Design a protein around this ligand. Structure first.
Ligand code: ADP
Ligand code: ADP
Ligand code: ADP
Ligand code: ADP
Ligand code: MG
Ligand code: MG
Ligand code: MG
Lengths: 520, 191, 535, 96, 550
């Protein structure tokens, strides 16, 4: 025999037919996961957990497909999530259609897969132009419009009923992380969960939330003005980087060796008490002998804290990451701490750190979630990532594109009108771009129970005459303009949807053959 | 599955008429034409019906050519009997040949003296039963101790014909399958 | 293209061969077959043991009998099986020589293939060399037809002793050679003679010793009389010395037709009548035989019991169950003809025999009749004996080979003198013409010359003589003197001239060794693709 | 193609015979002759092998001729010695 | 094509696999060549299309390059391994024509096997190719064209479009051709006393799936993919003349050497030993902090003692990285890579001359990734490439595609002479060699004639990949070229034909100068020689011997 190949070489036209059918199959799984009346999806992972959601990205993370063309479609959701954080299902559902509409031609009118690519870049260049023209700017400092902008994505989720609280929850969190250009990052956004409780009393509080309690019982559970000092080394006696190997000869040496173990921990504790802190947060563990004499000065000792939380404490309290204790000064000590208090919850203890609230480093915060169960917490946490993702685009880009499919439908109309004046060989793939852009509206209409036939016919008749902000009401299923409807989305999500969907088609269209089982 | 097959398989042309009023005509008459054709083939194959008391020159033809038949591989079974009138088993086997000859007309029943068959044959080995088919010897049977010996019956002889492939297992002429009319009468009453 | 690639069924078992190396195995495979039978050539040969799958054992030195009934795998050796058989069927002699001579042509042809010559062009050289070799042997051939029957009688012994000398029968070659010659005297017509081989039967009984074998004139039967009280030896009386042997196809039985029939038997009148019918039939039967005057009656099938006694009363013995093929041979020797029925029986169609006797063989419970004739009759039957089953089969085959060797002398009187004399005579004839006709086929003539030399070198190898002195003496002497009847003396005599040694061979037999060898090797050389489907 | 994953092209008869794993021991002796021809002379490693096969083919028929092998073997040694005497005669000298 | 497998031979007993000889070997070697030649035949040219190969773990690789697609195809046959290693030799040396050199070698072994069946020896066939190739390289020197009367960097732009084509980013060649040419002019250096050379893989590639390939930002400077040590450090250093300190020193709670075993009788020495063992590293970092190193670079790692010291001063830390990237940062910023800090005198110190210089440094976020972007270097300029796409598999395709594009423009600047592309070289060498050897006559006319036909497979392969009438283009190509070679020297129009040929987009004959199709002369030089030696290695094989593994 010959090399590890040639099992069944899918070559010629049938290879591309399987890819268009495979790419269409990925969109059919989450066809119903779009619009305000979208259905949820419970996926069963093989480890033992469960993922309850409707986001296309979180659905496609858990699924596994043994096909190489569908896996490239699987990776597009990571492009959208780790770029903005909203519209992942929009990316997957649009590309499917682009690959599908271009297929008739590939299969029958024999246009080679390179001429379609040249047609799409001019469509991509024109798509950014009309998306730039259809979008209207909006003021960033208007809190009334910002709340309606944030809740546009929440409306397609379960917590639309609590949208009055989530917009206030997300707006306060984004402004805290926002640095005075206007760059923010979600790594300090703490996603700590609390099972149980009501969503109404759930609120954001400035500062951090630990899972641990104090070590000694005599520590003050209520401090007016805490002074936090971060430590990296443990309070235990450091063995050292090299073996000691003390050659003991006299009887007065072993008690001296055990006595200097007590005096070294005294020396590091006494220099900590030069500034007299109230709360000492150590990264590594703590010894039983050292906590008492820190209590004699009035400190508070905690267990080992992972440094992911200490970096948040450094920005909240204004302290610095300190390991060498001999170089401890008064300037690097945290201050302006609001309040200290420990609540009793049956799961675990929880220590609260409040801020005085009154440029410098960006402040961190922890968002309290009080759901119904564990899956409700993970469901609501992904909604905050989808809701807070919307708040970044308006700050980075003041443009605001219309929602409800009006933006993509505007791309469909202009590409359809300009396709007549684009006479040549590029006319057939260029006109097929409008056929897929009018489907996002179709999907929304299909999930409402409406009829896509007369609504889209009524849509195109009023889109040219009425206005550029016309769209479909997902709840009622009638034509309602976005100006009166009062729901808007950013323009950045529309750019990534058009760019990622077209750029994905240019990769997959160049596939000629598929050969499986070569080597590792 | 077998309940549908027992309507046609377990009924002859005389018994298939029982289902004329119950079952469909096209379902029944389609099989009756098939079974009627099989009955016509057995009538054409009925070239025999009495014991052929032959002699040797002829053996080289009757016993062997016949075994070829049409040579459509129309083979014909030929049961030879090397008779010896002094033995008691030989006269018993001669009666079984004439009884089976009246029933199985397609199978050839051959008889010849054993002294005239083979030069200086052992008298102790007689009676001998040979079965030819397409020129080949299917069974060289020894004296009837295998078939009960002195107490051999017609039922044992008919069972031997089924083993060599001369008669089908479910044939209506065999005494094992040919249940008495009084037996079937009691079954219908107690059903 | 896919991973399966199939054109014909069962590609795994079918495997081809090609190139020079594929042909190399064929000639070297012939050396293994030739080397086995190389030692059995000549008077100093040694037999081979054969074992069948059924356990039956036999021993022999004839090349056709050795190669026959043997399990083979290669196809080229199966062609050598068919070779020796050819010469066994037509000629009946030279079966080992044609295989050794065929292998000698292949061995010399290999060297040539390697130096670099096309194979069909090599075979063309042997054809021109073979026709020139047989043509030169025909030129120096002596004819013995001009002599009278007395001297011609002696020439049959010179050739019969040759073929019997290379077997185990040669302990008395003068005695058993008369058996092979006296059998042909009784069938020859003495003018435009034909052998009529089918009349000459041949049967041997396992018993006694080989020295007790004596030739008879009649038919050997392997069966007893109808009753043991009959006399063993039956002589004629005062006149009509022929015993009037009546031969019959239909036995002593009741007459009846072939077709199926049932005789309807009425009341007691018809039952008593049929008892007189068959009782008068036997009285009519015995009167018909006594009217013909027969003394011995034989039928192919057994008589009835009552019939066995009715013949015994009138001094009328009978044999029963005489084979159908054996029944026809009895009528030819007795100068009779078989009657179809008993109504046509008359005096003219009866037989004639000198004397018969029932011969006993030790303590065994078997009986054999031995018919003898005082005058020269048509047929003749051999009577071979021996102290083993295989030695009788060896004596039958050794006598059969000698019977076929003398058969060639009858149809063709032109004989030759083999034993290395014809081979060296034909080898130098093509060698002297090789340097005259250099061309490109001179190496084929030299290969044909050296191939013929392997036969007398094989006789020199088996006899223990030096092949250097033997081959050099024949080449040097035959080039000097024109007399071409000097060959390899294997028995160790002081003189190599074969006029005094009493050795003669036929021309048709020695010719077929070269023809069937050179015609086979053309086919062996023309094979390039060799596909063998594994069983 | 050797046993391990190494592949090698070879026109040299010594390296051809070295990499070929032969089951027959007498044929394996030609591997050492090519090694001896490679070590002593370093040229004509296949010419010594093909002449050995030619002499064995010459000795094949002489075994059937009925001459002792030792007489055949000693004859090649005397003939080979005389062949060297012929080579020294026609040896054309050359200068450095 | 081979059927009815060779029989196991009893006369020739060799250990291991069976021996097979004859014409079946060269048939099997050609059949093994068609198994790999048909794979790469479809992905040739702009109209060519490529295939996918899975790695049996869910991962796959969509590959256009001949070296990459053959590297993953582990060929068990011996003859195929020659072409597999040839492509690995081709892409490392020249970085161009990896698909054509395999296609040329496959067509040579096709017609060479046909010539062996025509009963001419392979030695005469090899002599026919060598004398033909020696005239071919002589003809390549005749058809050279020196760049002259060209406005700006247009000759470097349009020649990059030829290498940029046959990829996914060929549509964006108008945007990438500028930055690719500008990148290699930024890493210019001097070596061997005036000889201009550029370093291998000097420009970086960062995989940041995101916005699009059109908006790829050319950062004029060096880029490094590394995470920040401490998140409290500042991500933007303001003010010009930022000093960069490149090191390879390791600064962690350091340990003493292997052959040191501490043994003390006094208990009180553990206080000083534990502090001096850590404090010995503080003497190294206290000297570089006082020197004003705003951003320190290091290969070996730095630990919490030192990391915190660096932060008490607003200094950026750097964790583990590759050893080669820090060398080019020192060359651009003007620093010196120090394996171990020391001095010729008897005391340790740190000089100011080891510091680099750059205008600005900032940690830009590529949508999930921390990357330190350095720009405005003082000593030597630098450049980096920010690749963007739809998914990570496309970014991997963009890596090797730019590596081929960077390699083509690299060898373009080494030799100013260029040669046109689009099958004009193969079409001209066909007719030129057919006219050659007409005076020679007897035997080598048939060998060189089939050699001339073997080069025509490239314009035939480009045509069928377009799904158009191929012989209509071959009739225009060869005929036009012939009418040019035969012509008088004095005929402008006809001579021009020598310059043009096949077009794969519009399907007509147009000028390559106005179209912009162009290749280097070095790409064709030593490509036919590698294909020649590839043909010689398989063509001289008569028998095949296989030894089974132990
Ligand atoms: N209330 C609504 N009515 C009609 N269309 C909507 C509504 N809300 C969202 N959409 C449409 O659904 C698409 C996706 O919005 P969203 O569900 O927030 O993102 P994702 O698809 O990531 O869940 C948008 O392009 C928008 O046009
Ligand atoms: N006594 C003898 N003297 C000389 N030559 C003999 C003698 N006996 C046999 N030969 C020779 O040996 C050869 C042996 O032939 P033979 O072996 O009988 O035939 P086959 O080879 O067919 O068995 C004969 O052709 C004959 O020439
Ligand atoms: N140019 C040539 N023309 C003709 N014959 C040659 C030429 N070169 C070498 N030969 C012959 O071919 C043979 C080659 O032997 P060679 O292959 O060198 O042996 P090895 O490879 O074992 O050293 C030499 O013996 C010589 O007679
Ligand atoms: N735009 C173009 N017009 C005409 N010919 C082209 C064009 N682009 C590439 N080619 C031809 O395609 C051949 C192969 O190009 P490419 O695939 O980039 O290199 P490789 O063979 O190394 O993969 C080249 O020989 C070149 O002549
Ligand atoms: Mg959303
Ligand atoms: Mg003989
Ligand atoms: Mg290329």
């Amino acid at each position: 025999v010959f090399m590890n190949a040639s099992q069944e070489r899918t070559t010629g036209r049938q290879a591309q037919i399987s890819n268009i059918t495979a790419a269409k199959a990925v969109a059919d799984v989450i066809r119903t996961c779009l619009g305000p009346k979208a259905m949820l999806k419970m996926l069963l992972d093989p480890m033992g957990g469960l993922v309850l959601t409707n986001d296309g990205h979180a659905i496609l993370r858990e699924i596994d497909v043994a096909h190489p063309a569908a896996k490239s479609m699987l990776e597009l959701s990571r492009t959208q999530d780790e770029e903005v954080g909203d519209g992942t299902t929009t990316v997957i559902i649009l590309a499917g259609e682009i690959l599908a509409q271009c297929a008739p031609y590939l299969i029958e009118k024999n246009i080679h897969p390179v001429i379609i690519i040249q047609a799409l870049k001019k469509a991509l260049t024109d798509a950014l132009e009309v998306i730039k023209q259809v979008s209207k700017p909006v003021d960033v400092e208007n809190d009334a419009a910002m709340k309606k902008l944030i809740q546009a994505s929440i409306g397609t989720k379960y917590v639309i009923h609590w949208s009055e609280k989530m917009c206030e929850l997300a707006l306060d969190a984004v402004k805290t992380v926002r640095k005075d250009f206007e760059i923010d990052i979600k790594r300090y956004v703490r996603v700590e969960k609390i099972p149980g409780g009501d969503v109404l009393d759930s609120r954001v509080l400035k500062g951090v939330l630990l899972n641990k309690d104090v070590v000694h019982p005599k520590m003050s559970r209520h401090i007016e003005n805490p002074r936090v000092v971060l430590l990296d080394c443990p309070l235990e006696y450091k063995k050292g980087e090299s073996q000691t190997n003390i050659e003991i000869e006299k009887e007065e040496d072993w008690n001296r060796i055990l006595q200097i173990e007590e005096e070294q921990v005294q020396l590091m504790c006494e220099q900590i008490l030069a500034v007299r802190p109230t709360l000492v947060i150590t990264e590594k563990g703590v010894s039983d002998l050292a906590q008492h004499y820190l209590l004699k000065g009035g400190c508070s000792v905690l267990r080992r804290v992972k440094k992911s939380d200490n970096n948040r404490i450094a920005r909240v309290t204004g302290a610095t990451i300190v390991n060498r204790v001999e170089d401890l000064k008064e300037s690097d000590v945290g201050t302006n701490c609001g309040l200290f208090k420990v609540e009793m919850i049956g799961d675990e203890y929880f220590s609260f750190l409040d801020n005085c609230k009154e440029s410098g480093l960006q402040k961190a915060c922890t968002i309290m979630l009080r759901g119904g169960s564990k899956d409700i917490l993970n469901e609501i946490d992904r909604n905050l990532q989808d809701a807070m993702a919307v708040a970044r685009n308006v700050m980075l880009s003041p443009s605001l594109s219309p929602g409800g499919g009006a933006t993509e439908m505007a791309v469909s109309v202009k590409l359809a009108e300009k396709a007549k004046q684009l006479e040549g060989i590029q006319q057939w793939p260029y006109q097929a771009v409008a056929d897929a852009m009018e489907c996002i509206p179709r999907t929304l209409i299909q999930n409402a129970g409406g009829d896509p036939i007369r609504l889209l016919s009524q849509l195109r008749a009023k889109h040219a005459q009425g206005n550029f902000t016309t769209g479909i009401d997902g709840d009622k299923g009638k034509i309602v303009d976005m100006v009166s409807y009062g729901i808007w989305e950013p323009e950045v999500i529309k750019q990534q949807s058009v760019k990622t969907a077209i750029e994905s088609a240019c990769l997959l269209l160049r596939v000629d053959d598929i050969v499986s089982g070569v080597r590792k | 599955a077998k309940q549908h097959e027992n309507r046609l398989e377990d009924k002859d042309l005389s018994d298939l008429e029982e289902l004329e009023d119950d079952e469909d005509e096209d379902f029944l008459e389609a099989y009756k034409i098939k079974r009627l054709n099989e009955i016509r083939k057995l009538q054409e194959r009925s070239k025999f019906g009495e014991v052929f008391h032959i002699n040797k020159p002829e053996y080289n033809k009757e016993v062997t050519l016949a075994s070829q038949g049409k040579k459509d591989d129309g083979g014909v079974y030929v049961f030879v009997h090397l008779s010896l009138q002094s033995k008691l088993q030989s006269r018993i086997l001669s009666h079984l040949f004439q009884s089976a000859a009246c029933k199985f007309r397609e199978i050839k029943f051959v008889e010849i003296p054993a002294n005239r068959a083979i030069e200086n044959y052992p008298e102790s080995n007689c009676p001998t039963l040979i079965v030819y088919y397409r020129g080949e010897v299917i069974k060289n049977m020894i004296t009837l101790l295998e078939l009960g010996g002195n107490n051999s019956k017609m039922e044992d002889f008919e069972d031997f014909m089924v083993k060599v492939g001369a008669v089908a297992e479910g044939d209506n002429r065999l005494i094992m399958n040919r249940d008495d009319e009084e037996s079937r009468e009691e079954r219908k009453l107690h059903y | 293209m896919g991973r399966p690639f199939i054109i014909v069924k069962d590609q795994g078992n079918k495997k081809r061969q090609h190139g020079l190396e594929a042909k190399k195995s064929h000639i070297l495979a012939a050396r293994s077959v030739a080397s086995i039978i190389k030692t059995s050539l000549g008077p100093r040969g040694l037999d081979k043991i054969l074992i069948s799958p059924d356990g039956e054992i036999t021993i022999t030195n004839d090349g056709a009998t050795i190669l026959s009934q043997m399990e083979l795998d290669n196809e080229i050796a199966k062609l050598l099986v068919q070779l020796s058989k050819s010469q066994d069927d037509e000629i009946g002699d030279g079966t080992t020589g044609v295989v050794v001579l065929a292998s000698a042509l292949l061995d010399q042809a290999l060297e040539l293939i390697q130096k670099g010559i096309h194979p069909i062009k090599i075979a063309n050289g042997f054809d021109e060399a073979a026709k020139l070799a047989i043509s030169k042997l025909e030129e120096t051939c002596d004819d013995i037809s001009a002599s009278n029957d007395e001297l011609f009688r002696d020439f049959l012994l010179r050739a019969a002793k040759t073929s019997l000398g290379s077997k185990i029968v040669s302990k008395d070659h003068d005695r058993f050679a008369e058996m092979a010659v006296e059998a042909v005297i009784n069938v020859m017509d003495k003018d435009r003679k034909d052998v009529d081989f089918d009349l000459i039967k041949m049967q041997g009984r396992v018993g006694g010793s080989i020295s007790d074998s004596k030739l008879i004139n009649g038919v050997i039967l392997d069966k007893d009389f109808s009753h043991p009280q009959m006399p063993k030896c039956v002589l004629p009386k005062e006149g009509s010395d022929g015993v009037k042997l009546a031969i019959l196809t239909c036995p002593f039985e009741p007459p009846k037709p072939k077709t199926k029939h049932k005789l309807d038997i009425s009341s007691v009148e018809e039952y008593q009548k049929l008892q007189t019918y068959e009782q008068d039939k036997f009285k009519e039967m015995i009167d018909d035989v006594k009217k013909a005057g027969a003394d011995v009656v034989i039928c192919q099938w057994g008589f009835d019991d009552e019939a066995n006694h009715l013949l015994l009363q009138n001094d009328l013995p009978a044999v029963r169950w005489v084979g159908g093929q054996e029944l026809e041979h009895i009528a030819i020797s007795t100068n009779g003809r078989i009657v179809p029925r008993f109504q046509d029986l008359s005096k003219d169609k009866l037989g004639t025999c000198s004397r018969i006797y029932e011969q006993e063989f030790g303590t065994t419970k078997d009986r054999m009749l031995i018919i003898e004739q005082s005058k020269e009759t048509k047929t003749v039957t051999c009577f071979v004996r021996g102290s083993n089953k295989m030695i009788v089969d060896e004596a039958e085959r050794a006598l059969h080979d000698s019977l076929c060797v003398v058969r060639n002398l009858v149809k063709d009187s032109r004989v030759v003198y083999g034993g290395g004399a014809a081979e060296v005579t034909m080898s130098l004839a093509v060698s002297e013409e090789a340097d005259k006709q250099r061309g490109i086929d001179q190496y084929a003539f030299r290969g044909f010359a050296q191939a013929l030399d392997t036969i007398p070198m094989t006789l020199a190898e088996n006899s223990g003589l030096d092949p250097i002195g033997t081959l050099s003496t024949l080449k040097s002497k035959q080039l000097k003197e024109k007399i071409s009847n000097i060959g390899v003396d294997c028995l160790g005599y002081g003189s190599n001239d074969m006029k005094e040694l009493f050795v003669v061979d036929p021309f048709i037999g020695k010719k077929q060794q070269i023809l069937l060898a050179t015609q086979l090797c053309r086919m062996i050389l023309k094979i390039d693709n060799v596909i063998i489907s594994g069983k | 193609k050797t046993s391990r994953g190494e592949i090698i092209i070879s026109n040299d008869g010594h390296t051809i015979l070295k990499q070929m794993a032969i089951l027959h021991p007498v044929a394996r002796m030609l591997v050492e002759v090519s090694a001896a021809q490679d070590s002593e002379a370093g040229d004509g490693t296949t010419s010594v092998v093909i002449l050995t096969g030619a002499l064995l083919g010459a000795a094949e028929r002489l075994l059937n001729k009925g001459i002792h092998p030792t007489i055949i073997a000693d004859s090649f040694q005397s003939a080979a010695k005389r062949s060297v005497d012929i080579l020294l005669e026609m040896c054309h000298k050359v200068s450095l | 094509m081979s059927q009815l497998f060779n029989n196991s031979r009893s006369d020739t007993l060799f250990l291991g696999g069976e021996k097979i000889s004859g014409d079946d070997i060269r048939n099997q070697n050609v059949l093994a060549t068609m198994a790999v030649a048909n794979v790469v035949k479809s992905s040739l040219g702009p109209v060519g299309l490529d295939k996918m190969l899975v790695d049996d773990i869910g991962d796959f690789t969509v590959t256009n390059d001949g070296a990459t697609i053959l590297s993953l195809l582990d060929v068990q046959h011996p003859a195929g391994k020659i072409l597999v290693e040839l492509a690995q030799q081709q892409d490392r040396e020249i970085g161009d024509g990896t698909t054509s050199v395999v296609i040329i070698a496959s067509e040579l072994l096709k017609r060479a096997n046909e010539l062996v069946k025509n009963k001419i020896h392979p030695t005469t066939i090899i002599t026919g190719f060598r004398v033909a190739l020696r005239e071919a390289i002589r003809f390549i020197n005749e058809v050279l064209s020196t760049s002259v009367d060209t406005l700006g960097k247009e000759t470097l732009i349009n020649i990059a479009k030829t290498s940029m084509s046959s990829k996914i980013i060929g549509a964006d060649s108008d945007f990438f051709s500028n930055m690719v040419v500008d990148a290699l002019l930024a890493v210019k250096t001097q070596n061997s006393k005036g000889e201009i050379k550029y370093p291998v893989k000097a420009v970086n590639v960062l995989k940041a799936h995101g916005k699009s390939a059109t908006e790829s930002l050319l950062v004029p400077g060096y880029a490094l993919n590394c995470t920040v040590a401490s998140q409290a450090m500042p991500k933007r250093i303001a003010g010009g003349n930022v000093k960069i300190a490149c090191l390879d020193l390791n600064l962690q709670k350091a340990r003493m050497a292997m052959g040191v075993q501490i043994n003390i009788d006094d208990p009180e020495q553990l206080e000083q030993i534990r502090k001096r063992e850590a404090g010995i590293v503080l003497e190294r970092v206290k000297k570089i902090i006082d020197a004003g190193a705003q951003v320190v670079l290091t290969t070996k790692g730095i630990d919490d003692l030192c990391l915190k010291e660096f932060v008490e001063a607003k200094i950026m830390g750097v964790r583990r990285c590759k050893k080669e990237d820090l060398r080019r940062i020192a060359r651009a910023t003007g620093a010196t890579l120090v394996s171990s800090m020391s001095n010729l005198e008897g005391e340790e110190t740190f000089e100011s001359s080891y510091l680099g210089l750059c205008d600005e440094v900032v940690q830009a976020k590529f949508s999930d990734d921390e990357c330190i972007l350095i720009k405005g270097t003082s000593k030597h300029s630098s450049s980096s490439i920010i690749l963007r796409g739809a998914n990570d598999y496309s970014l991997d395709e963009m890596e090797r595609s730019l590596h081929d594009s960077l390699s083509v423009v690299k060898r373009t600047l080494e030799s100013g002479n260029v040669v046109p592309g689009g099958g004009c070289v193969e079409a001209a060498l066909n007719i030129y060699l057919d006219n050659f050897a007409t005076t020679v006559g007897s035997r080598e006319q048939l060998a060189i004639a089939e050699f001339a036909a073997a080069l025509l497979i490239i314009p035939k392969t480009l045509a069928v990949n377009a799904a158009k009438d191929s012989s209509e283009l071959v009739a225009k190509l060869r005929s036009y070229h012939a009418a040019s070679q035969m012509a008088k020297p004095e005929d402008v129009k006809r001579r021009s034909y020598r310059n043009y040929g096949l077009d794969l987009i519009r399907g007509k004959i147009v000028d390559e100068i106005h179209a912009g199709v162009l290749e280097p002369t070095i790409s064709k030089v030593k490509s036919l020689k590698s294909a020649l030696e590839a043909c010689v290695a398989i063509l001289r094989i008569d028998t095949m011997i296989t030894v089974d593994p132990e």
